[PDB]
Amino acid sequence: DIQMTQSPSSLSASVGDRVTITCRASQSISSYLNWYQQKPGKAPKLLIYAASSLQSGVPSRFSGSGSGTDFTLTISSLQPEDFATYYCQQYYDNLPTFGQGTKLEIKRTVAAPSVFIFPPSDEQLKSGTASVVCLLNNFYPREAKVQWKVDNALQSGNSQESVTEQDSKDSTYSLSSTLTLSKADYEKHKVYACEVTHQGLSSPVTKSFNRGE
Amino acid sequence: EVQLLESGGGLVQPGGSLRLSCAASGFTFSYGSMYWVRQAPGKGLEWVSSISSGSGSTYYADSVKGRFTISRDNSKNTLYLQMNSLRAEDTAVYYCARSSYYGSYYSIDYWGQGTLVTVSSASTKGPSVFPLAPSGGTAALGCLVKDYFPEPVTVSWNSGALTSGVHTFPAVLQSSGLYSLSSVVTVPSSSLGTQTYICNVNHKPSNTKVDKKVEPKS
Amino acid sequence: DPCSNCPAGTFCDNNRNQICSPCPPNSFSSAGGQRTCDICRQCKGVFRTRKECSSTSNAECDCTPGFHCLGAGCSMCEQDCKQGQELTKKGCKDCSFGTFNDQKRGICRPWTDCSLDGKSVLVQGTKERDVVCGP
Ligand SMILES: [Mn+2]
Numbered sequence A: 001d002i003q004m005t006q007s008p009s010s011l012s013a014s015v016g017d018r019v020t021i022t023c024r025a026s027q028s029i030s031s032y033l034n035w036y037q038q039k040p041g042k043a044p045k046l047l048i049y050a051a052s053s054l055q056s057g058v059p060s061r062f063s064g065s066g067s068g069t070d071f072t073l074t075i076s077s078l079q080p081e082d083f084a085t086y087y088c089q090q091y092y093d094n095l096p097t098f099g100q101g102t103k104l105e106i107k108r109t110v111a112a113p114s115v116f117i118f119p120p121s122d123e124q125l126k127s128g129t130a131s132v133v134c135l136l137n138n139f140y141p142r143e144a145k146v147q148w149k150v151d152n153a154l155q156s157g158n159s160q161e162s163v164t165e166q167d168s169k170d171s172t173y174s175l176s177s178t179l180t181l182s183k184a185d186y187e188k189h190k191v192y193a194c195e196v197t198h199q200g201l202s203s204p205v206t207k208s209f210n211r212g213e
Numbered sequence B: 001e002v003q004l005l006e007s008g009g010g011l012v013q014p015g016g017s018l019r020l021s022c023a024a025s026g027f028t029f030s031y032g033s034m035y036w037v038r039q040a041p042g043k044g045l046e047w048v049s050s051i052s053s054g055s056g057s058t059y060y061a062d063s064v065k066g067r068f069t070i071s072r073d074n075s076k077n078t079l080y081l082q083m084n085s086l087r088a089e090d091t092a093v094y095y096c097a098r099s100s101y102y103g104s105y106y107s108i109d110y111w112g113q114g115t116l117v118t119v120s121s122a123s124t125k126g127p128s129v130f131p132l133a134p135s136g137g138t139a140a141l142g143c144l145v146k147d148y149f150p151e152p153v154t155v156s157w158n159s160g161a162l163t164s165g166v167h168t169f170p171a172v173l174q175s176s177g178l179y180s181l182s183s184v185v186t187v188p189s190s191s192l193g194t195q196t197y198i199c200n201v202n203h204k205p206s207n208t209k210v211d212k213k214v215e216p217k218s
Numbered sequence C: 001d002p003c004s005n006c007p008a009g010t011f012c013d014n015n016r017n018q019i020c021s022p023c024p025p026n027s028f029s030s031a032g033g034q035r036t037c038d039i040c041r042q043c044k045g046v047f048r049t050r051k052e053c054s055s056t057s058n059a060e061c062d063c064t065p066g067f068h069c070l071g072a073g074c075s076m077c078e079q080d081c082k083q084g085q086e087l088t089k090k091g092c093k094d095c096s097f098g099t100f101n102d103q104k105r106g107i108c109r110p111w112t113d114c115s116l117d118g119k120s121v122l123v124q125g126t127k128e129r130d131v132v133c134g135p
Helices: A184-187
Strands: A004-007 A010-014 A021-024 A033-038 A045-049 A064-067 A070-075 A084-090 A102-107 A115-120 A129-138 A144-151 A159-163 A173-182 A190-199 A206-211 B004-005 B020-026 B034-038 B045-052 B058-060 B066-071 B078-083 B092-102 B105-111 B115-119 B130-132 B138-148 B154-157 B165-168 B179-188 B198-203 B208-211 C010-013 C018-024 C047-050 C060-063 C067-070 C076-079 C085-088 C093-096 C122-125
Touching: A004 A084, A004 B058, A010 A159, A021 A084, A021 A102, A033 A064, A033 B105, A033 B130, A033 B165, A045 A064, A045 B092, A064 A173, A070 A084, A084 A184, A102 A184, A102 C085, A115 A190, A115 B138, A129 A144, A129 A184, A129 B179, A129 C018, A144 A159, A144 A173, A144 B179, A173 B179, B004 B092, B020 B034, B020 B092, B020 B115, B034 B066, B034 B105, B045 B078, B058 B066, B078 B092, B105 C018, B130 B198, B130 B208, B138 B198, B154 B179, C060 C067
Parallel strands: A010 A102
Antiparallel strands: A004 A021, A021 A070, A033 A045, A033 A084, A064 A070, A084 A102, A115 A129, A129 A173, A144 A190, A159 A173, A190 A206, B004 B020, B020 B078, B034 B045, B034 B092, B045 B058, B066 B078, B092 B105, B092 B115, B130 B138, B138 B179, B154 B198, B165 B179, B198 B208, C010 C018, C047 C060, C067 C076, C085 C093
């Protein structure tokens, strides 16, 4: 079979920077090599065909090189919209194998998140479960510590996190942390706090509420 | 206008079979090829199958060979993917695609929107939608879409009209084996009371179509 | 040779280790085992496209209105005449008495002899219709 190895798996680079993505074939594939760009929720877009031919409607900053086994994709001056997963694909043998992909992160200045705490709705409490949500809005870098405190006691195992994909215009992230408790455990305690640690904050930010307004 | 539309996706038990359909319009399949490409959640693109125009010569990836069959009913302009002996690794968004000819060869150019195939023994469960009632002049509100299976669930705000400041978070598989997500919107604090905010939740597998108005509690 | 297996609509690709590759646009292969696809015929000028070209079949031409196809695979365009006429060097001329032509193309043919089948003439032939015989 023909294997397509892409290098690296991921990279972070600033607006204006130049990046290179490698693609190696297990055997010679001449110039029958394509480069695709996949943005979250969008269909993959053909950037380069025949190893080095730039497709019409594709910016001159995207360029291709190689023949045989080793192939290279370069982006001459990164834009915030360039955040995507890049894939190579070979068309030499009727079995068009894709490379494993290269996820491209756009580097940006530190942006502190705005923090929001949501108590469980009265609708949910009637069902026997309490979900407390903590929102971190438009921050960079992605790396953030979200700690749940119930009557000043740090929680463990009862929370899950979810992060959005990098915003294509302002290059930031958003996070939601959900603390799940039973109605009995939720009604037993008073102070519900969400503590956030991030590079953009001088010291950790705590958002809290006292059950029963 | 070239249009590709997949259908037949859904929940299927391991060992089972599923047949996908891809309806095409705006072209005659007299040249090139048509394909099936799949994408496992958070993983890379995997080409699985091809069919040549005229002859109907087929090609398969080693990962699906012997289990999957591609075919084209030209009279109906429909491409099929018969998928037998399905396993958890086959869980993916399945895309049908059409070729274009550039630099002396045919390659993938057109893609459909995809159809999600979930290979699981778990049962379909509809979600519960709870409001997340309304930081440096910024206010946040949202909807908690809890306890559903399988994926996907679509979330809109004021029937697609409100898109700015919206964040629909990827679903997390809870310890119960059911998914949960929240969809939020931030607005300037001072604007609260000048606009209404309704989250429109749709979970097609369970015929769930929920429109929830988010208001401040009293 | 492995090329012989390549079916109509494909060519044995010399640039990719003799694999079967679909015919490129504007080309066809109505037979198998070809190493190149044949260029499609262009239906232009006096010619018009009837059946568009595909990977498995060549484009089929028609003629401009007031003209019809002549020879195998529509190689020429011949001028149309009216029913009851035929084409001569000096243009369309009416069928001579005793002959007919029910088509906008071709030549005048003598009327059928009803008496040959022991049949009567019920309706005499015209320039555009043959005779109608009895039972
Ligand atoms: Mn935001």
